[PDB]
């Protein structure tokens, strides 16, 4: 790979420079190179990886939605063709992330924070593939996303407190999966309510560091619940 000749520490440094310059495609490429060195990522390095690829795929998803909305309720082939181009690029980025998770990052060892973080990421990027897939492929992708999310949930409920921001963000995303991807509004609503309820019941045991982080996500859960009811 193009980063094979660069020192791990220099790749991390350059990822941070790319973030400052808002060059997220570069940032993701540096972090991919760092992952491929084969060593575990620190918490700070996990966040760099996630920020980089979330920004890359976030832009592709937003474009795909723009084009898909123009295509729907609308003729020449141009809009479909360009929507398909964006879709293909998006799938390529998701396949890269999922390959990195499988080949390097998801392991039986390590603390709960790291194991849940990577399994949630796996569920998220399968969910992004599901947003654009059709037919038998979409059914396979949905089951893969569910399986990853459920493995992350099983860990988070045994190894993390109900106010932990990673556990909360996982439940939030899995409930979105239930509502938007899996056609299971009742499971989405249930999961989001239970998750909010149990966070609220334990809010007094919250360490200052993770106050804003926790309540921000609790806010997102409630605002989704407003919509699904």
């Amino acid at each position: 790979g193009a980063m094979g000749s660069m020192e791990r520490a220099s790749l991390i440094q350059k990822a941070k420079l790319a973030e400052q310059a808002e060059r997220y495609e570069d940032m993701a490429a540096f972090m991919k190179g760092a992952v491929e060195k084969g060593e575990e990522l620190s918490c700070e390095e996990r966040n760099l990886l996630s920020v980089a690829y979330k920004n890359v795929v976030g832009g592709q998803r937003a474009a795909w939605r723009v084009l898909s909305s123009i295509e729907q309720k609308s003729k020449g082939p141009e809009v479909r063709e360009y929507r398909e181009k964006v879709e293909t690029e998006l799938q390529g980025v998701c396949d890269t992330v999922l390959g990195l998770l499988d080949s390097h990052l998801i392991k039986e060892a390590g603390d709960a924070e790291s194991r849940v973080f990577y399994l949630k990421m796996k569920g998220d990027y399968y969910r992004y593939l599901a947003e654009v897939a059709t037919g038998d492929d979409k059914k396979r992708i949905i089951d893969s996303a569910r399986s990853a999310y459920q493995e992350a949930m099983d860990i988070s409920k045994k190894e993390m407190p109900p106010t932990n921001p990673i556990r909360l963000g996982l439940a939030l995303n899995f409930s979105v999966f239930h509502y938007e991807i899996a056609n299971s509004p009742e499971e989405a609503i249930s999961l989001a309510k239970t998750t909010f309820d149990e966070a609220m019941a334990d809010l007094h045991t919250l360490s200052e560091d993770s106050y804003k982080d926790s309540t921000l996500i609790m806010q997102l859960l409630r605002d989704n619940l407003t919509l699904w009811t």
């Binding site: 998220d124 963000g169 996982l170 939030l172 995303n173 979105v176 509502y179 938007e180 921000l216 996500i217 997102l220 605002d223 989704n224 919509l227 699904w228």
Partner: peptide, 6 residues
Amino acid sequence: RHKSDS
């Protein structure tokens, strides 16, 4: 209209 982890 719903939101995922931000």
